[PDB]
Amino acid sequence: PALTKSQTDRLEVLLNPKDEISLNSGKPFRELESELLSRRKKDLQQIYAEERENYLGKLEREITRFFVDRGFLEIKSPILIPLEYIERMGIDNLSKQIFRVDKNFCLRPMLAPNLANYLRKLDRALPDPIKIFEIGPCYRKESDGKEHLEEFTMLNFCQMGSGCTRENLESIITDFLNHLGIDFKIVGDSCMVFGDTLDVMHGDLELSSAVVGPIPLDREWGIDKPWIGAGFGLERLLKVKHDFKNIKRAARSGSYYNGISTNL
Amino acid sequence: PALTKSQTDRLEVLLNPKDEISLNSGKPFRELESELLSRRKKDLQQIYAEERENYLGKLEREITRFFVDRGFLEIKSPILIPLEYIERMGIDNLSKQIFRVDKNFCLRPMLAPNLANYLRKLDRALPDPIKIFEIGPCYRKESDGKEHLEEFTMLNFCQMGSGCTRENLESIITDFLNHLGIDFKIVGDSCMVFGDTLDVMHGDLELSSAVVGPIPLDREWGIDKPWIGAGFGLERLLKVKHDFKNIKRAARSGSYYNGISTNL
Ligand SMILES: Nc1ncnc2c1ncn2[C@@H]1O[C@H](COP(=O)(O)OP(=O)(O)OP(=O)(O)O)[C@@H](O)[C@H]1O
Ligand SMILES: Nc1ncnc2c1ncn2[C@@H]1O[C@H](COP(=O)(O)OP(=O)(O)OP(=O)(O)O)[C@@H](O)[C@H]1O
Ligand SMILES: N[C@@H](CCCCNC(=O)OCc1cccc(C2(C(F)(F)F)N=N2)c1)C(=O)O
Ligand SMILES: N[C@@H](CCCCNC(=O)OCc1cccc(C2(C(F)(F)F)N=N2)c1)C(=O)O
Numbered sequence: 001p002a003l004t005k006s007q008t009d010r011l012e013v014l015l016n017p018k019d020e021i022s023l024n025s026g027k028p029f030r031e032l033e034s035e036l037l038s039r040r041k042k043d044l045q046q047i048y049a050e051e052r053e054n055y056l057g058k059l060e061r062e063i064t065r066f067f068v069d070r071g072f073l074e075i076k077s078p079i080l081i082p083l084e085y086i087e088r089m090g091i092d093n094l095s096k097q098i099f100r101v102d103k104n105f106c107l108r109p110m111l112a113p114n115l116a117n118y119l120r121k122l123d124r125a126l127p128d129p130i131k132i133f134e135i136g137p138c139y140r141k142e143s144d145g146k147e148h149l150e151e152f153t154m155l156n157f158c159q160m161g162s163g164c165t166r167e168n169l170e171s172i173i174t175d176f177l178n179h180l181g182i183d184f185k186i187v188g189d190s191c192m193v194f195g196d197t198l199d200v201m202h203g204d205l206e207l208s209s210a211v212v213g214p215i216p217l218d219r220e221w222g223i224d225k226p227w228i229g230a231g232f233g234l235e236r237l238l239k240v241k242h243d244f245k246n247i248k249r250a251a252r253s254g255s256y257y258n259g260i261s262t263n264l
Numbered sequence: 265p266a267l268t269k270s271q272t273d274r275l276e277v278l279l280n281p282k283d284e285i286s287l288n289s290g291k292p293f294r295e296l297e298s299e300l301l302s303r304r305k306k307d308l309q310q311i312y313a314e315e316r317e318n319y320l321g322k323l324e325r326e327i328t329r330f331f332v333d334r335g336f337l338e339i340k341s342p343i344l345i346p347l348e349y350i351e352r353m354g355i356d357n358l359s360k361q362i363f364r365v366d367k368n369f370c371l372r373p374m375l376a377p378n379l380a381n382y383l384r385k386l387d388r389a390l391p392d393p394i395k396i397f398e399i400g401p402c403y404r405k406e407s408d409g410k411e412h413l414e415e416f417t418m419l420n421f422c423q424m425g426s427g428c429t430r431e432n433l434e435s436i437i438t439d440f441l442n443h444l445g446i447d448f449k450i451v452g453d454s455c456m457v458f459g460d461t462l463d464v465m466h467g468d469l470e471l472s473s474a475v476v477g478p479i480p481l482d483r484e485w486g487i488d489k490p491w492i493g494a495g496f497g498l499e500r501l502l503k504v505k506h507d508f509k510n511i512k513r514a515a516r517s518g519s520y521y522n523g524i525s526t527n528l
C-alpha cells in the first residue's frame with residue numbers, strides 16, 4: 001500500500017533525525033505511526049525525567065555565559081520599538097517584513113538599533129572598549145521556508161572603541177562557533193542597512209551577518225568610534241546542532257518540544 | 265535656591281534607593297547632579313568590571329533553575345498569538361489592553377493559553393502529574409503608573425493531575441518566594457478569566473494571581489483534570505528586591521541598566 005500526502009506529513013512530523021526509518025518501505029502507515037509515536041513518547045519522557053530544559057532557553061543561557069565571561073555586558077532591551085527606528089536605520093519604504101503595532105511602534109526585526117543606543121550611552125560612563133550583547137525575540141514577515149521563521153531569536157554582540165578590527169571580529173566569531181562545535185566559513189555579502197557584511201555560513205545556511213564599522217549610518221545614531229558587531233539566529237544554530245530538516249523544530253512553538261512533536 | 269520640576273526629575277532619575285541624599289537640602293542642583301553622576305558611573309563601572317549580568321535575565325535564569333530542579337518542564341512558546349485565544353479565554357470585548365498585530369494576531373497579555381495547550385498535549389505523553397512553567401515577555405496597554413509596564417515579563421508555573429490542591433499551590437508559592445527572600449501574604453481576589461484567585465501580595469503590591477482549578481473555562485481548552493497555576497511579574501519581584509520607587513527601573517529599557525540611569 002502507498003501512503004497519502006497526509007499520512008507522509010504525519011510521519012514526517014513524528015520522525016526525528018536520529019531515526020533510520022524508511023517511510024516508503026511498504027510497511028503500513030499504522031505500524032510506522034505506532035513505532036514513531038512510541039519513540040517520541042519515550043524521548044519526551046526522558047527529557048521530563050532527566051533534563052527539563054528547553055533548547056532555546058538553554059542555548060540562550062549558554063551563549064549568555066560565553067559573552068559575560070568574555071567581558072560583554074548583558075542587555076535586555078525593548079522588543080516593541082518605535083517605527084521611527086526603522087526609518088533611521090535606512091530601511092526605506094525588509095520594510096515590507098515589519099510587523100506594525102498600533103500607529104508608531106513595531107516589533108523589532110533586529111537588535112541593532114537598541115544596541116547602537118546602548119553603545120552611545122555607555123561610552124559616557126564605561127572604560128574603552130565598550131562590549132555588549134543581547135539575545136532575544138525578533139520578528140519579520142517571511143515567505144516561509146525551511147530556514148525562516150516569523151518569530152525568531154537573535155544574538156547580537158558588538159564592541160566600540162579599541163580592538164574593533166576585522167581580525168578581532170573574526171576571532172570572536174571563531175571562538176564562539178568553536179564553543180558551540182559548529183563548523184563555518186566566512187563569505188563576503190552586502191545588505192541595505194550596513195553595506196558589506198561578513199556572512200558566517202554553514203554550508204548554504206547563513207548563521208550570521210557581521211559588520212566592521214564605521215559606516216555612514218553611524219552619524220544618525222550618535223556613533224562616532226570604530227565598532228564591530230554580528231547578529232546570529234539561535235534557531236539556525238539549533239537547526240545545525242540537531243540536524244533538523246525544518247527550522248520550525250527549533251522555534252517557539254506549541255507543536256514541537258526540543259524537536260519532538262507535541263501531537264502524540 | 266529652589267529646584268525646578270525639570271531639575272528634580274533629573275536628580276530623581278540619578279538617585280538610587282541606597283543613597284541618603286536630600287534633594288531639597290539647599291545645596292545647588294549642579295553639585296547634587298555632579299555627586300549623583302559620579303556615584304552612578306562608579307556603580308555602572310563596577311557592574312561592567314565584576315558582574316555583567318542584566319537583572320531581568322539573571323532573575324529569569326534563577327527562577328528557571330528553581331522550577332527545573334523541582335520537576336517542571338521549561339516552556340518557550342510564541343509571544344505573537346492568535347486573537348482567537350483572547351476570545352476563547354473569556355476576555356469579552358483587559359480586552360482593551362490587548363496590542364493587536366495585523367488582523368488575526370496579538371501580543372500575548374498572559375502566558376496561560378499557551379500553557380493550557382501544553383498541559384493538554386503533554387498529558388498524552390508524560391506521567392502524572394504534568395508540571396510546566398514559562399518565563400517571558402507579555403504585553404498590556406496600561407494607564408502607566410509605578411507598578412504597571414506595557415512590556416513586562418511573566419512567570420507562570422502550573423501543574424495538572426494529582427497534587428493539584430490549594431495547599432500544594434500555596435506551598436510552591438511559599439517555597440518560591442522564600443527562595444527569593446520576599447515576604448508576602450495571600451488574599452482572596454477575583455478576576456474575569458479565572459474567577460476567584462489567590463492573590464500573592466507584598467504590602468499593597470500584587471506579585472501574583474493564582475488559581476486552583478478546575479474551572480468551567482477548562483472545557484474550551486480541552487483541560488479535563490484538576491490543575492493549579494500562578495502568574496508572577498518579574499519586574500515587580502525586582503521592584504521589591506531592589507526597593508525601586510518606579511517599576512520602569514526594572515523594565516526592558518534603554519533608559520536604565522540594573523536600575524542605574526543610562527543618561528550619564
Ligand atoms: N526570518 C528569520 N528566521 C530565523 N532566523 C533569521 C531570520 N532572519 C534573520 N535570521 C537570523 O538573523 C541573522 C542576522 O539577520 P540578517 O538581517 O543578517 O538576516 P538575513 O541576511 O535577512 O538572513 P536571510 O538572508 O537568510 O534572510 C541571520 O544571519 C540569521 O541567522
Ligand atoms: N502591566 C503590568 N506590568 C507589570 N506586571 C504586570 C502587569 N500586569 C500584570 N503583571 C504581573 O503579572 C501577574 C499576573 O497577571 P494578572 O492578570 O494577575 O495581573 P493583574 O491582576 O491585572 O495585575 P494588576 O491588578 O496589578 O493590574 C500580576 O500579579 C503582576 O505581577
Ligand atoms: N543587525 C544586523 C546584524 C549585524 C549587526 C551590526 N550592528 C550591531 O552590531 O549593533 C551595534 C551597532 C553599533 C554601531 C552602530 C550601529 C548602527 C545602527 F544604527 F544601525 F544601529 N550603524 N549605526 C549598530 C542585522 O540583523 O541585519
Ligand atoms: N494567567 C493568569 C495567572 C494565573 C494562571 C492560571 N493559568 C495557568 O496557570 O495556566 C495553566 C492553565 C491550566 C488549565 C487551564 C487553563 C485555562 C485557560 F484556558 F485559561 F488557559 N482555564 N482553562 C490554564 C493571569 O495572568 O491573569
Ligand SMILES: [K+]
Nearest residue numbers: 016017018019
Ligand atoms: K530521520
Ligand SMILES: [K+]
Nearest residue numbers: 151251252342
Ligand atoms: K513561533
Ligand SMILES: [K+]
Nearest residue numbers: 280281282283
Ligand atoms: K534614595
Ligand SMILES: [K+]
Nearest residue numbers: 078415515516
Ligand atoms: K520596555
Ligand SMILES: [Mg+2]
Nearest residue numbers: 094140142148
Ligand atoms: Mg532575510
Ligand SMILES: [Mg+2]
Nearest residue numbers: 189199206209
Ligand atoms: Mg542574508
Ligand SMILES: [Mg+2]
Nearest residue numbers: 191206208209
Ligand atoms: Mg544577513
Ligand SMILES: [Mg+2]
Nearest residue numbers: 358404406412
Ligand atoms: Mg491589570
Ligand SMILES: [Mg+2]
Nearest residue numbers: 453463470473
Ligand atoms: Mg490584580
Ligand SMILES: [Mg+2]
Nearest residue numbers: 455470472473
Ligand atoms: Mg491578578
